[PDB]
UniProtKB/Swiss-Prot annotation:
Residues represented out of the complete protein: 26 to 753 of 1544
Effect recorded for residue 199 to Y: Abolishes lysine-specific histone demethylase activity
Free-text tissue specificity from the UniProt record: Ubiquitously expressed, with highest levels in testis. Down-regulated in melanoma and glioblastoma. Up-regulated in breast cancer (at protein level).
Protein known as: Lysine-specific demethylase 5B
Organism: Homo sapiens
Annotated disease: Intellectual developmental disorder, autosomal recessive 65: A disorder characterized by significantly below average general intellectual functioning associated with impairments in adaptive behavior and manifested during the developmental period. MRT65 patients have moderate to severe intellectual disability, developmental delay, and facial dysmorphism. Camptodactyly is present in some patients.
Length: 453
């Protein structure tokens, strides 16, 4: 009746021993947590990073949000942290005519789903979302200011979210392409009912979220295996979200009742994340939620060796949908192979397996365009080109291994799947532009094999 809360997602309480290495722990819980999409992690009781900030000197620009189910919103005036906190507390307090910490969490959840479904409520809220900067920085300790002995303790923690991208069990790391939205932590200031719509991470990566302080955050999550099942339910009830988006900054997303999904046999899980807890989302796991009140959270994307195959399948899927990429997956693979001597040995072994698939697909593709009559060729350093200067005119994929050009249409490229879409000239006028010959590639893969012994 009205709202039936989904079943709870798994909650983990690792010992200090298990907690020490984040990457080993995530790998251990993976068979459980990948069945539910999200999961929650309670750190050992004495792991408590200091949070310190001046509420008057931190300022940020707020986003405004309307709260209607199935209405399109796009992914990605001034407040100090204090003035925002005052606005947010007054708002919740007046909405319920109660002291903000006496409003039960079950009630806010029930009320959230009522107000987004009711056509005649026009409730709007405000929130903060931004990567770290000079005006507003990480809530975790970072180097700069003289630090206290306890701040120093957490500087090199694996669960300090600043460190997590640049550790060596992670495969974004040795990458230099500066895909900034994905190596840097985002900061989120919440108030009651402020919401994050249904979505998955760029390139189907993991994410990890830490709530520093304040009232809880409520999550809904769907396992990766049910991603297409959820998208079919979404297309049927709100097709406007699926019209082709011009850019990467034009992704359309929405609020949708998890009960609607469960009615159509999509598995949904929930949790309340409290201050000092982590939530982790797994590859291709849809998630959404809202805040119970005034709070402060920090989040980061990351990629493990487990993810490498999915990362390839994802870029393939982007091509079918003509979606833009954040980075080139093959460029990342080749960059790791060129640094094979300093890679973790398990990393090296997993990269090698992906590289073997890459090379075999590339061989087949070059044979196919040769038989279409493209004969001329020249080496080309794709990584020097700005990304928007090396997308396939048809499918918008970011080229790195190879592309086709023509003197007729200067500066345009197509990937090798779309040779017929460049122009109307005969194929002998075309040129195959390539980063590596097959003979360059096999020694790069052999270096990985040696490093992996
Ligand atoms: O196996 C699960 C797991 C979670 C969940 O919320 C649901 C199911 C069935 C499918 C939707 C409802 C019933
Ligand atoms: Cl509404
Ligand atoms: Mn997310
Ligand atoms: Zn293409
Ligand atoms: Zn031409």
């Amino acid at each position: 009746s009205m709202f039936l809360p989904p079943p709870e997602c798994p909650v983990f309480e690792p010992s200090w021993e298990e907690f020490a290495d984040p990457f080993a722990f995530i790998h251990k819980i993976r068979p459980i947590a990948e069945q539910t999409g999200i999961c929650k992690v309670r750190p050992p009781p004495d792991w408590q990073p200091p949070f310190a900030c001046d509420v008057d000197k931190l300022h940020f620009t707020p986003r405004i949000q309307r709260l209607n189910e199935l209405e399109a919103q796009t992914r990605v005036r001034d407040y100090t942290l204090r003035t925002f906190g005052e606005m947010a507390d007054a708002f919740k307090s007046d909405y319920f005519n109660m002291p903000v910490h006496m409003v039960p969490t079950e009630l806010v959840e029930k009320e959230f789903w009522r107000l987004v479904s009711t056509i005649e409520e026009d409730v709007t809220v405000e929130y903060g979302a931004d990567i770290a900067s000079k005006e507003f920085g990480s809530g975790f300790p970072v180097r700069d200011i003289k630090l206290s002995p306890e701040e120093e303790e957490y500087l090199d923690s694996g669960w300090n979210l600043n460190n997590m991208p640049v550790m060596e069990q992670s495969v974004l790391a040795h990458i230099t392409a500066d895909i900034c939205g994905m190596k840097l932590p985002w900061l989120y200031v919440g108030m009651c009912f402020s919401s994050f719509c249904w979505h998955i991470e760029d390139h189907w990566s993991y994410s990890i979220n830490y709530l520093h302080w304040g009232e809880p955050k409520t999550w809904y999550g769907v396992p990766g295996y049910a991603a297409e099942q959820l998208e079919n339910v979404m297309k049927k009830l709100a097709p406007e979200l699926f019209v082709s988006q011009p850019d990467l900054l034009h992704q359309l997303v929405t609020i949708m009742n998890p009960n609607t999904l469960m009615t159509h046999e999509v598995p949904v899980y929930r949790t309340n994340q409290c201050a000092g807890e982590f939530v982790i989302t797994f590859p291709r796991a849809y998630h959404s939620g809202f805040n119970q009140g005034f709070n402060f959270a920090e989040a980061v994307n990351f990629c493990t060796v487990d993810w490498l195959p999915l990362g390839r399948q994802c870029v393939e899927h982007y091509r079918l949908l003509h979606r833009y990429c954040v980075f080139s997956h093959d460029e990342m693979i080749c960059k790791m192979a060129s640094k094979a001597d300093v890679l973790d040995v398990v990393v090296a072994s997993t990269v090698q397996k992906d590289m073997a698939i890459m090379i075999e697909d590339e061989k087949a593709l070059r044979e196919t365009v040769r038989k279409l009559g493209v004969i001329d060729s020249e080496r080309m350093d794709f990584e020097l080109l700005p990304d928007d200067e090396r997308q396939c005119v048809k499918c918008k994929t970011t080229c790195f291994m190879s592309a086709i050009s023509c003197s007729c249409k200067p500066g345009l490229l197509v990937c090798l799947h779309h040779v017929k879409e460049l122009c109307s000239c005969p194929p002998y006028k075309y040129k195959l532009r390539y980063r590596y010959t097959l003979d360059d590639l096999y020694p790069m893969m052999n270096a990985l094999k040696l490093r992996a012994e």
